[PDB]
Design a protein around this ligand. Structure first.
Ligand SMILES: [Zn+2]
Ligand SMILES: [Zn+2]
Lengths: 90, 90, 90
């Protein structure tokens, strides 16, 4: 019984984001080239996946947090985490 | 018990694919910039991971579906899912 | 019930790396355009995630291996796997 992680990165420094699902909560650790620090993302979930992409210099991150059969998409687009349009129907 | 997902994205719109393993079946949800829809991928698996890459305008997707100690690679290269040559000795 | 995998890819060939967590061991399978082979990475873990990036033609890989609440980061930067600076407080 171990925590479950997901990772993404962008750029050439690079920036790295590691999401950890632990006891029903997902938290975020961040690297921007200097050191690791705790990120703003903190949402419920037993399982996590992530993907990201750049548009110019702007990073866009999508975190897929799952509890039971419900997957919630969380969006970072430069100004805070927001709930995305993703639905599944599991 | 929660479902397990894997996500990938390409391009700048972007396109996103989210794979969900649920009770031994993997299904696929797709975003191409307008809304989410159900993808063609549907294969057995209790665990899924994914990676993708572009060569010019051509997208390639590799989905690794596992049941027990067996991992099957599924390939998208523009015209249907096929599977791949991947083998493991788990 | 099943093994757990993580995948990454880079370049246009492409190179693919698939990490498998199985009974407390994470192992690595590699594709560089010709066939699959077993990689050098072999470390303890019940869960694995991965990310990678290019700096020019040089590939960098980060593998996040977790046991219990401890996540260890493993780094490939061209010349062997080394433990990274990642820490979490799970
Ligand atoms: Zn359960
Ligand atoms: Zn191709």
């Amino acid at each position: 019984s171990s925590v479950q992680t997901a990772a993404t990165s962008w750029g050439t420094v690079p920036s790295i984001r590691v999401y950890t699902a632990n006891n029903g909560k997902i938290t975020e650790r961040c690297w921007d080239g200097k050191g690791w620090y705790t990120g703003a993302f903190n949402e419920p979930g037993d399982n996590v996946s992530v993907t990201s992409w750049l548009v110019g210099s702007a990073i866009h991150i999508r975190v897929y947090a799952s509890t039971g059969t419900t997957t919630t998409e969380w969006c970072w687009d430069g100004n805070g985490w927001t709930k995305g349009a993703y639905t599944a129907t599991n």
